[PDB]
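Dear V.,

Thank you for sending over the compound details. I've combined the ligand you provided, A1AD9, with the protein sequence from our construct and run the structure prediction for the complex. I'm sharing the raw inputs here so there's no ambiguity about protonation or stereochemistry in the SMILES, which I know was a concern on your side last time.
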Amino acid sequence: PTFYRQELNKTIWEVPERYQNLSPVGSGAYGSVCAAFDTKTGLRVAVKKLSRPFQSIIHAKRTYRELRLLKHMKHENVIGLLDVFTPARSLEEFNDVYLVTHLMGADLNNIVKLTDDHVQFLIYQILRGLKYIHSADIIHRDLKPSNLAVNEDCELKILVATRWYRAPEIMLNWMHYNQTVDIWSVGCIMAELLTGRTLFPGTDHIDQLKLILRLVGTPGAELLKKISSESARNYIQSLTQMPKMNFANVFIGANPLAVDLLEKMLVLDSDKRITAAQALAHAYFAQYHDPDDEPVADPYDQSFESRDLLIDEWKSLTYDEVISFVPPP
Ligand SMILES: Cn1cc(-c2ccnc3[nH]ccc23)c(-c2ccc(F)cc2)n1
Ligand SMILES: Cn1cc(-c2ccnc3[nH]ccc23)c(-c2ccc(F)cc2)n1
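Below is the predicted structure of the protein with A1AD9 bound, written out as structure tokens.
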């Protein structure tokens, strides 16, 4: 189809005729997004242009990783792809990638204190998206208010210091963390929507861990005997020991079912944290939970993550992924 060129805040854009009325939303290191009208579907869409997708092996692999993940994500509460395109006619020319999805209004950071029913529906949608993501053996690792797209209907999709929502095993740089790092982030988000304050606004990674242990208590011997690192065990055992606080006391006034769920998500031992699938069955989501509409994902191959390839190999794989793309109906 026919492409049209255009400059927007220094960034150049080459998009098909079907996308009209471009309009910068925001930009940064990874790339610029534009809002647009999709003439073919009647939809407002976001169009993300990647910054220099094949600058290096790192960039080429990151580009491939993002396109593969977005092509796989097919769920009401995870961002997926309406379209992917390049203005290039062959592999030799290919140097730009554009990604298209349903325009969302605002982030969960912008919507902020919410009422208990709003908190139930937003955390329900996150957990339903995370059940799907985790079922593919994907770990988000970066769940925070800014990575949650919400529209005026309170419909939520998974896409402010990052450390504030990070599980304590990532503060001390554990290399074998599991998917419940994401449940820790959900617990921190749910706290912040109930209270109107960051649960653990650490000034750095050391302060961040001290605020966490202040609420959840320093580890018992059951957790300490799973810490392989001698420096980390020495450090954690050398802190002044604080007990697990009563969550009923800290979240005074909240739904006791919200409090119970928070206790199940912010357990220090990652092996004892509630899973996304378990959390959806919790009494706090009785108004919203439906076990025949909480779907899992098709299996997801990320063996490419263990491969060391040339820039042009990552580039051609990415090109291959643009060409095989089938739009949703
Ligand atoms: C950081 N970031 C936000 C958006 C985004 C998505 C939907 N609605 C939005 N409204 C304002 C930004 C935004 C994207 C994006 C755009 C297109 C894609 F295909 C994939 C991701 N990245
Ligand atoms: C290196 N490392 C692993 C863990 C860890 C955390 C949670 N669950 C786990 N299961 C097996 C190891 C492990 C921690 C840690 C524990 C307590 C803290 F207060 C701060 C960090 N450090």
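A first observation: The longest strand covers residues 19-26.

Warm regards,
I. M.
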